[PDB]
Structure 1
């Protein structure tokens, strides 16, 4: 038993970032996507020196807003502590991507959390 559609994978984070910066970046981007709901990334699963994180959002609406935000906004983290993540001309950094985790990978997230 779990609430479906809460989880978003964020890809192409700066490898030397941290959970606090990810939280601020997500909130900054979320606020440009909507002012109707607040940014509530309840848990951020992130390991230092990785370029991906899994976000457990408070509700499915939050997760959907996150997906829409990164699809419509070009963002690239320029340093480990960059929150606003403006793409720079000529930068070799890739664009931040957010994907909803579904299917067996979603089931396994909750199974491993409860292990």
Structure 2
């Protein structure tokens, strides 16, 4: 069926005990350092407690691209469940936060499942 392409980013290596509020703040903190031209508008955050992944539905494709560029440029690691600035700490076992654009069949299935 029908959807706006290229809105979705998977965020990987979140702290497993975080929440949507913290994810929103972290994305806005990181996005701020990539651009001042447009506001951070993660319209929906799909996140289940005790997972290490979220799916973000951005307002526009340019917001999604901005997020991907931010995490590609910036080394970030979420230290604790409520860490928003996510500075990498020397000797930390935490992995680097990663943002990937969801495409192809994975993208179609997101919109199919949302509409089920």
Q: TM-score, normalised by structure 2?
A: 0.99
CA–CA separation in structure 2 for the residues paired with 1:110 and 1:70: 24
CA–CA separation in structure 2 for the residues paired with 1:2 and 1:78: 35
CA–CA separation in structure 2 for the residues paired with 1:104 and 1:77: 29
Structure 1 position 43, deviation (Å): 0.1
Structure 1 position 31, deviation (Å): 0.3
CA–CA separation in structure 2 for the residues paired with 1:70 and 1:97: 6
Counterparts of residues 75-94 of structure 1 (less than 5 Å): 75-94=76-95
Partner of 2:64: 63
**Partner deviation per Cα, 1:4-60 (whole Å, 9 max, x = no partner):** 000000000000000000000000000000000000000000000000000000000
Structure 1 position 70, deviation (Å): 0.1
Q: TM-score, normalised by structure 1?
A: 1.00
Residue 9 of structure 1 aligns to a residue in which SS? strand
Q: Unaligned 5+ residue runs, structure 1?
A: none
Structure 1 vs Structure 2 CA RMSD: 0.1
CA–CA separation in structure 2 for the residues paired with 1:3 and 1:65: 17
Q: Unaligned 5+ residue runs, structure 2?
A: none
Structure 1 position 76, deviation (Å): 0.1
Count of residues in correspondence between the two structures:
115
